[PDB]
mmCIF file of C-alpha atoms and ligand atoms in Angstrom:
data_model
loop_
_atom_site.group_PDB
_atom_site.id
_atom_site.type_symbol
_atom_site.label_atom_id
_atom_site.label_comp_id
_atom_site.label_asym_id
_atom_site.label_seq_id
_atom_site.Cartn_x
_atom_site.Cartn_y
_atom_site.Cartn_z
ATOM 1 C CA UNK A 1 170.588 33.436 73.154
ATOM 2 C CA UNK A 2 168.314 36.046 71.627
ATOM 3 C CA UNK A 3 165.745 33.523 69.769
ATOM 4 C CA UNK A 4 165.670 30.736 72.612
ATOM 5 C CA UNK A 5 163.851 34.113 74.411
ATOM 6 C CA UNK A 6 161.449 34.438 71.762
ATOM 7 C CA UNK A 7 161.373 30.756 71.457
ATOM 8 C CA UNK A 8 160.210 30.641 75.195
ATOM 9 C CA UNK A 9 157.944 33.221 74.330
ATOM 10 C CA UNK A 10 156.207 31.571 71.479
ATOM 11 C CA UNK A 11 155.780 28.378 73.456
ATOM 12 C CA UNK A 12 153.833 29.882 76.508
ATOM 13 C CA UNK A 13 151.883 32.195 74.114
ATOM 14 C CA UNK A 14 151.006 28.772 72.171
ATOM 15 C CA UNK A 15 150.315 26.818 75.523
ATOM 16 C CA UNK A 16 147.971 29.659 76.262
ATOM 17 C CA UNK A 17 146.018 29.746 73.027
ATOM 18 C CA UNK A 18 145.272 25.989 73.644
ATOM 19 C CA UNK A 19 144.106 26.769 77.318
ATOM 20 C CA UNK A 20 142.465 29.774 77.366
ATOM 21 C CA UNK A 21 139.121 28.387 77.620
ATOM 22 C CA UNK A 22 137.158 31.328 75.123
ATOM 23 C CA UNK A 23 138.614 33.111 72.502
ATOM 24 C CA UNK A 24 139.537 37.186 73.599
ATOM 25 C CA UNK A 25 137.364 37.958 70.208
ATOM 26 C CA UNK A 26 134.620 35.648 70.588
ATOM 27 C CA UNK A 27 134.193 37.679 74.892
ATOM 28 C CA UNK A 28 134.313 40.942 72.867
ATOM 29 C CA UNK A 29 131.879 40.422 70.329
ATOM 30 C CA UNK A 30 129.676 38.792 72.879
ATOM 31 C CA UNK A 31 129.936 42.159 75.341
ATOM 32 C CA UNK A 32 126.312 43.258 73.825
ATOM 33 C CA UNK A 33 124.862 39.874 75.190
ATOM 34 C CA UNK A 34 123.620 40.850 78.322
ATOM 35 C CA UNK A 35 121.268 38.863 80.966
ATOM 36 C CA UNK A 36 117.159 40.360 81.345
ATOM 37 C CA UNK A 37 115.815 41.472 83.681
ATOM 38 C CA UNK A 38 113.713 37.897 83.739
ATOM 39 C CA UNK A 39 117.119 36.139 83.332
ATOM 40 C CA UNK A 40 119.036 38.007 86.093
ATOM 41 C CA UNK A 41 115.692 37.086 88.260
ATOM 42 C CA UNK A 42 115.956 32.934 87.455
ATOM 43 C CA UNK A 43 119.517 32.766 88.960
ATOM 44 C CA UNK A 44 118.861 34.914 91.994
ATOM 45 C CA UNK A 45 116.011 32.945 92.659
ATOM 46 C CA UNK A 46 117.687 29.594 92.376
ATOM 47 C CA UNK A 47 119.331 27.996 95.543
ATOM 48 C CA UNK A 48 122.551 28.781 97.077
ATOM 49 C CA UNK A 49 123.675 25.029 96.855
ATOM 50 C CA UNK A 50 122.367 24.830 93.548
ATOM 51 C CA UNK A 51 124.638 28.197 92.335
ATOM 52 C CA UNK A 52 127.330 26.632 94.112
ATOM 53 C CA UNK A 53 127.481 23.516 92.073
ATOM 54 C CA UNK A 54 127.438 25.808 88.963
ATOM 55 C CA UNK A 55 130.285 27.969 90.346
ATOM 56 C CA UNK A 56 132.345 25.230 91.551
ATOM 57 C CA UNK A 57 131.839 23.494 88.103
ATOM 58 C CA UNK A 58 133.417 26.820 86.330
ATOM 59 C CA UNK A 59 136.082 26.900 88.398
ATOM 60 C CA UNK A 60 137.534 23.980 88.504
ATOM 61 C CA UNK A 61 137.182 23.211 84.426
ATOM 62 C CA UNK A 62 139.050 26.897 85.052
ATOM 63 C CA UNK A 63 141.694 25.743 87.212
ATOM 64 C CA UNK A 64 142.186 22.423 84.940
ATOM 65 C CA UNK A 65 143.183 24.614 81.953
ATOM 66 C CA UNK A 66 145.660 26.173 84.149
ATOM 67 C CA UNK A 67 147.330 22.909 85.249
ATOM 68 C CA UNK A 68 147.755 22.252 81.443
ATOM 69 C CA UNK A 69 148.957 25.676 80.564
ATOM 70 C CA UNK A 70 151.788 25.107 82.631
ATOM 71 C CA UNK A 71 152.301 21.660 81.880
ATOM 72 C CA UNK A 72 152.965 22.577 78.669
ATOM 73 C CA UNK A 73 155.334 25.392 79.656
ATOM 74 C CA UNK A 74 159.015 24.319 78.408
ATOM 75 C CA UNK A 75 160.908 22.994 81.682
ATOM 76 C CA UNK A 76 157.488 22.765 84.190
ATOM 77 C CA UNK A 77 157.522 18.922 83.309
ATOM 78 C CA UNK A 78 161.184 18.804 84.268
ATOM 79 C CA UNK A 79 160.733 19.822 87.609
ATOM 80 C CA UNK A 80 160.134 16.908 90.457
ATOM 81 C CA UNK A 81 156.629 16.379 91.315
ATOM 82 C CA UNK A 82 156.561 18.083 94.630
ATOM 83 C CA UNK A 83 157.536 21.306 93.198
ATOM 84 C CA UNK A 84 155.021 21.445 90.156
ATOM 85 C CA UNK A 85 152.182 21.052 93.282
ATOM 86 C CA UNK A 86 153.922 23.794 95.244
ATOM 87 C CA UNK A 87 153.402 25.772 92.453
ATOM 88 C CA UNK A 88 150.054 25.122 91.196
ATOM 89 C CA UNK A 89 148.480 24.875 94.402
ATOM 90 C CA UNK A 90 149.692 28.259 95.633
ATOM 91 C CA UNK A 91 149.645 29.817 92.278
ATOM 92 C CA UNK A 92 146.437 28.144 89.410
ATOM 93 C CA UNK A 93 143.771 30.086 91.385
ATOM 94 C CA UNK A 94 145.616 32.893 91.295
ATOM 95 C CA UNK A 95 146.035 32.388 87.287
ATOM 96 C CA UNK A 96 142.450 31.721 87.445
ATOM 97 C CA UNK A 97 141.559 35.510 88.643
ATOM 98 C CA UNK A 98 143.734 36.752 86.894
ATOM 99 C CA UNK A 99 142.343 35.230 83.740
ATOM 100 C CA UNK A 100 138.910 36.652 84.625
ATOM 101 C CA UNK A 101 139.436 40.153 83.888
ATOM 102 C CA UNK A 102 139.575 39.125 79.314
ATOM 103 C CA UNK A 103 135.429 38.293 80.355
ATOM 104 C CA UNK A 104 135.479 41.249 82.201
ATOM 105 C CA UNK A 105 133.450 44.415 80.931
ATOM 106 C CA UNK A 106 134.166 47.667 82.812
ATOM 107 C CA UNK A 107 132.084 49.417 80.959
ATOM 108 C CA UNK A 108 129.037 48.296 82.369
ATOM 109 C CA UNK A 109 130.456 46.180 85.328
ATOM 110 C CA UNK A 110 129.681 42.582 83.921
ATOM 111 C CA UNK A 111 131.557 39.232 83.558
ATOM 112 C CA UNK A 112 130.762 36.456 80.923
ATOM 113 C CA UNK A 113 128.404 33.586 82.688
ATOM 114 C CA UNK A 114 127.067 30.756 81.172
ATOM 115 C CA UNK A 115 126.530 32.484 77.733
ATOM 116 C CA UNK A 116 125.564 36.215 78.640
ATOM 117 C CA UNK A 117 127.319 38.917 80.381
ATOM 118 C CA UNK A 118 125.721 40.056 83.921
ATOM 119 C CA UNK A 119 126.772 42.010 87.188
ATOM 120 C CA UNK A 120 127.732 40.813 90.590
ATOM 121 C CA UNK A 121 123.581 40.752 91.457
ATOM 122 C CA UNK A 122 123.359 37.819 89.324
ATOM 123 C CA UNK A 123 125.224 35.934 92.059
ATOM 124 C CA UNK A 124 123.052 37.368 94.796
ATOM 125 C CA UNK A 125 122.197 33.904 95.817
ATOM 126 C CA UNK A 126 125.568 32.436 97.039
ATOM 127 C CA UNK A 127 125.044 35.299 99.814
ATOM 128 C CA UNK A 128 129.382 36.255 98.967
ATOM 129 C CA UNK A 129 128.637 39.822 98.011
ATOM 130 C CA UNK A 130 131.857 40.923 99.712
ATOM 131 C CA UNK A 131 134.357 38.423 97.683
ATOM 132 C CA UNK A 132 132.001 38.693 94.825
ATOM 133 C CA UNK A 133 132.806 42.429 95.129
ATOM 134 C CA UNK A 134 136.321 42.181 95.906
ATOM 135 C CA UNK A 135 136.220 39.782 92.643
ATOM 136 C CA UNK A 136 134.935 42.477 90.294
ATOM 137 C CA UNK A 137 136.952 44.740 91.618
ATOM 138 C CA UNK A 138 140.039 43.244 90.606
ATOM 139 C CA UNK A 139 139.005 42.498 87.549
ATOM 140 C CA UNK A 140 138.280 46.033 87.058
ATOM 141 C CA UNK A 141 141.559 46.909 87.737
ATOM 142 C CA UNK A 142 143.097 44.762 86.012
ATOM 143 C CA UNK A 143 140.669 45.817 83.147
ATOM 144 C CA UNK A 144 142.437 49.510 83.244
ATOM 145 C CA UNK A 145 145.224 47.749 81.937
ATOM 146 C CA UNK A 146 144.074 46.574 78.690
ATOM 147 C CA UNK A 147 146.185 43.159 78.506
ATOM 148 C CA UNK A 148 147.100 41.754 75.398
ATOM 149 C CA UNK A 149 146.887 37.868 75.202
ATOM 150 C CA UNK A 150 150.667 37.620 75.126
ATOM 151 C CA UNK A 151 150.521 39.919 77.865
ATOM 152 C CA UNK A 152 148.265 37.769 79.810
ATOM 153 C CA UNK A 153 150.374 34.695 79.149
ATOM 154 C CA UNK A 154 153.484 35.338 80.175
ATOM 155 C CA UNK A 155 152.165 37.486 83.404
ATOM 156 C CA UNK A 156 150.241 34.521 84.399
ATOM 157 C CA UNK A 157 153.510 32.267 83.485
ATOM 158 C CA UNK A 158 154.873 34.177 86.099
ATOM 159 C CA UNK A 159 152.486 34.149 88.738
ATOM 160 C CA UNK A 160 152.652 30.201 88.583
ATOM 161 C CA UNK A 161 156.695 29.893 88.125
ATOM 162 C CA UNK A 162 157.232 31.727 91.514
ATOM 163 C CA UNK A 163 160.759 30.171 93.507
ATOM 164 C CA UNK A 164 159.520 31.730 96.678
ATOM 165 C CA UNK A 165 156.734 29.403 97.318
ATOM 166 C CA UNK A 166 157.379 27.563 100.737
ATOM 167 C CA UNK A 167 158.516 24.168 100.563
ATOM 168 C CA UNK A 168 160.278 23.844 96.932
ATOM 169 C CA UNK A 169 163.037 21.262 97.514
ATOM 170 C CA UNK A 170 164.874 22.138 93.803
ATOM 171 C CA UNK A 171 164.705 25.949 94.152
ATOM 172 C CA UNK A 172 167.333 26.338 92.108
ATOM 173 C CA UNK A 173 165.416 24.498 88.876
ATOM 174 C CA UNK A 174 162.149 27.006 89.423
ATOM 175 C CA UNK A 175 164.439 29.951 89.775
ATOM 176 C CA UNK A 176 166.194 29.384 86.187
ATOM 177 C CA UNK A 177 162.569 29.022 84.850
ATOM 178 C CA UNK A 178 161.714 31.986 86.660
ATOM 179 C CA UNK A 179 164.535 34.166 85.267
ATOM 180 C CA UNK A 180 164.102 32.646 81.507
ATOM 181 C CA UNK A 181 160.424 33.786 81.945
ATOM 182 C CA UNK A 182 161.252 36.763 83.206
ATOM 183 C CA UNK A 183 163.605 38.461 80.322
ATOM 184 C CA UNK A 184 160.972 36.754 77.786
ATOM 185 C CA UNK A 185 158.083 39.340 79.640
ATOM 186 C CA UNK A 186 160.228 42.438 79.896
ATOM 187 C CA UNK A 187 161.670 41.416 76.480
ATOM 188 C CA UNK A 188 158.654 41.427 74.949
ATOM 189 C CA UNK A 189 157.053 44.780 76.981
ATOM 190 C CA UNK A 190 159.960 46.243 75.536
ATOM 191 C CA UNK A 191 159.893 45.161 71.824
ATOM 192 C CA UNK A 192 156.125 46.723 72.304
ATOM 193 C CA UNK A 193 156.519 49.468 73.777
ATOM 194 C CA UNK A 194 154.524 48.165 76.655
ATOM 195 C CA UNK A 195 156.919 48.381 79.635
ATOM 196 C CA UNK A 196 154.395 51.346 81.562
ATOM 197 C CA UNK A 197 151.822 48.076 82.424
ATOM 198 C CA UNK A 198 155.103 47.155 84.786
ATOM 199 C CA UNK A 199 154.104 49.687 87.369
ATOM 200 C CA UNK A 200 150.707 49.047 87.112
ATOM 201 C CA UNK A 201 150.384 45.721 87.918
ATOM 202 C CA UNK A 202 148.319 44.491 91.303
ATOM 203 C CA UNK A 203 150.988 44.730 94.074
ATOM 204 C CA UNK A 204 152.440 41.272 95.175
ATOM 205 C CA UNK A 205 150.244 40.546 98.212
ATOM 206 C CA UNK A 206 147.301 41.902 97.014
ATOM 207 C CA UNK A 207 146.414 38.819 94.476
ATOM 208 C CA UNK A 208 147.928 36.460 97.541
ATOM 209 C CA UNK A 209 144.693 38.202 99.429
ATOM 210 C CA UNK A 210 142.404 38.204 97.164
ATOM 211 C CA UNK A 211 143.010 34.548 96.615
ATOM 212 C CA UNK A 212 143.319 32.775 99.718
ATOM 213 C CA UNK A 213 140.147 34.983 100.944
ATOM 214 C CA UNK A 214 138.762 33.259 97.138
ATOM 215 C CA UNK A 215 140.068 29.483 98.348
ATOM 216 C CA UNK A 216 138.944 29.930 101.490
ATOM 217 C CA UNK A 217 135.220 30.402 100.919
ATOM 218 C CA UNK A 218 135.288 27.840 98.343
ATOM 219 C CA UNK A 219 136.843 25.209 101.196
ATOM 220 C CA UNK A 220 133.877 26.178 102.858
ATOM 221 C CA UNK A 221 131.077 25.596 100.176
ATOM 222 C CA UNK A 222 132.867 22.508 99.621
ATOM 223 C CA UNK A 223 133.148 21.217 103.509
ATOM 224 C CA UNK A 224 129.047 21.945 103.802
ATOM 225 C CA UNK A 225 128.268 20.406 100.411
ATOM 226 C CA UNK A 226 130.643 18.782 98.227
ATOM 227 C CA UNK A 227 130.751 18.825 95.077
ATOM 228 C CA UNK A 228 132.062 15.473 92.630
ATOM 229 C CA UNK A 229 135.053 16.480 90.639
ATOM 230 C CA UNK A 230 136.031 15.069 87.449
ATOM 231 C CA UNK A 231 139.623 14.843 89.029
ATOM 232 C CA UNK A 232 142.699 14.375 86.108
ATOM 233 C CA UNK A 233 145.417 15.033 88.347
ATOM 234 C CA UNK A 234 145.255 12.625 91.275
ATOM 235 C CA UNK A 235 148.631 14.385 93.164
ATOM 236 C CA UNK A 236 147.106 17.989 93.138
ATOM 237 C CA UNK A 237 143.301 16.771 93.742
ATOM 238 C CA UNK A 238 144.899 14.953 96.993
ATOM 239 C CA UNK A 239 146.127 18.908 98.200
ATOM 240 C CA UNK A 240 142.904 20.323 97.197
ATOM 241 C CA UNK A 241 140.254 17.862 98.588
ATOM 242 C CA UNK A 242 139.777 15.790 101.849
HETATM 243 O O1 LIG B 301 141.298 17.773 88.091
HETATM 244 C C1 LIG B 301 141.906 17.754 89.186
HETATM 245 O O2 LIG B 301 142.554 16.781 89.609
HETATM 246 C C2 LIG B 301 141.771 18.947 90.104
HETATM 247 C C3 LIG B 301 140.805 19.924 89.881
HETATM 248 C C4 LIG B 301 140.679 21.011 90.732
HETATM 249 C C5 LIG B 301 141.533 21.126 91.823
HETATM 250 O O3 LIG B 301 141.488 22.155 92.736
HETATM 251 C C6 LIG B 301 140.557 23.232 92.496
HETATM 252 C C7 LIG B 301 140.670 24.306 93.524
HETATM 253 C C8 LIG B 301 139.628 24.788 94.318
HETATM 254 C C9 LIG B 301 138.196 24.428 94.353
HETATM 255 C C10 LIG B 301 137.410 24.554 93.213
HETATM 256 CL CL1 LIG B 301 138.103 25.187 91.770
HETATM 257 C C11 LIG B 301 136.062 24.217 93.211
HETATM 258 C C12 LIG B 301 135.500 23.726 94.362
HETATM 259 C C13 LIG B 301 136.266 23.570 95.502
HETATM 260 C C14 LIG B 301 137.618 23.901 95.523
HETATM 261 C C15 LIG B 301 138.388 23.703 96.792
HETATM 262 F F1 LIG B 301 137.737 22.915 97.635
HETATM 263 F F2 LIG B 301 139.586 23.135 96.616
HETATM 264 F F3 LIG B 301 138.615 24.836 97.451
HETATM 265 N N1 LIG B 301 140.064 25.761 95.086
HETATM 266 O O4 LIG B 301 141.445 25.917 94.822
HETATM 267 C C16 LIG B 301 141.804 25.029 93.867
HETATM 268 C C17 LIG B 301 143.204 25.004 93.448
HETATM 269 C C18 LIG B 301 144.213 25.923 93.780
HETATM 270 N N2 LIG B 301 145.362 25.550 93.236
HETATM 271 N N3 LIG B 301 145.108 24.412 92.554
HETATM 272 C C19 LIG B 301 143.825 24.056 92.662
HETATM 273 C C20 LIG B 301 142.499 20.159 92.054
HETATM 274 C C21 LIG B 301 142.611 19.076 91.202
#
């Protein structure tokens, strides 16, 4: 079935347009507006709790996109409830660093925050500078690779629709939507002549790292001073929050 392919194609590049958060063109034309001196000076002056309320804010608008992303991925609905948490609780941070590197600059080392673009010393505050590094870092590589949006999508399809994950009960379900996802990306590296990024891409492991080490430290911000969530999906908030 050659068009169901580009059919599945269409419908996670259109899920992604609607979730993406900021448009690709709207983070490039923005890449001259760059943080002062003065500016970079108001949020390392401002308290760690206070930066961690803005951070935590980000993220989870961030990883609320993802859960609709793949909710409106063609068969994610269809699976029971237990796997879709599986899956997004291992897997929507992951899409959510992934996601960073489009506000990503490498060629001055900045990130899109609130409005401007700034390096990791504009986070000096949450006293992180090792994840914060390890952060940029990836998004610098991932940078190298010059990602196109469909590129993005159906990479970050992936990294959600994973039938590995410990404790699927209907493995069998996530592995056909795994496989179906799978000939749409190579399909469409290949009809692109795009098929090099395959060897490039961060070695399985090293995003698991990155993000539990990511997870982690937020668990810990969150245990010493919670923040209120604006919680839409009761099942996955229960995983997330205690
Ligand atoms: O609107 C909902 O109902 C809703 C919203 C977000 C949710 O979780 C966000 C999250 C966080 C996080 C974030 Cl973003 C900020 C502060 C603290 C955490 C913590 F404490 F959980 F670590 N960290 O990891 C995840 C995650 C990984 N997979 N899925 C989610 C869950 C449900």
């Amino acid at each position: 079935s050659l068009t169901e392919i580009e059919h599945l194609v269409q419908s996670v590049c259109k899920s992604y347009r609607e979730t993406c958060q900021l448009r690709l063109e709207d983070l490039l034309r923005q890449r001259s507006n760059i943080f002062s001196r003065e500016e970079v000076t108001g949020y390392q002056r401002k308290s760690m709790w206070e930066m961690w309320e803005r951070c935590a804010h980000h993220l989870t608008e961030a990883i609320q996109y993802v859960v609709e992303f793949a909710k409106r991925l063609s068969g994610f609905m269809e699976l029971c409830q237990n796997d879709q948490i599986v899956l997004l609780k291992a897997g929507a941070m992951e899409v959510v660093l992934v996601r960073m590197c489009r506000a990503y600059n490498a060629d001055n080392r900045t990130v899109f925050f609130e409005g401007k673009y700034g390096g990791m010393e504009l986070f000096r505050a949450l006293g992180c500078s090792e994840l914060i590094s390890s952060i940029f870092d990836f998004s610098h590589s991932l940078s190298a690779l010059h990602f196109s949006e469909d590129e993005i999508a159906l990479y970050t399809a992936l990294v959600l629709i994973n039938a590995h994950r410990p404790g699927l009960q209907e493995k069998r379900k996530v592995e056909q939507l795994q496989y179906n996802l799978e000939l749409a990306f190579h399909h469409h590296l290949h009809k692109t002549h795009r098929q090099s990024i395959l060897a490039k891409l961060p070695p399985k492991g090293k995003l698991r790292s990155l993000c539990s080490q990511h997870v982690e430290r937020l668990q810990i911000f969150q245990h010493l001073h919670p923040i209120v969530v604006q919680a839409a999906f009761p099942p996955l908030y229960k995983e997330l929050f205690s």
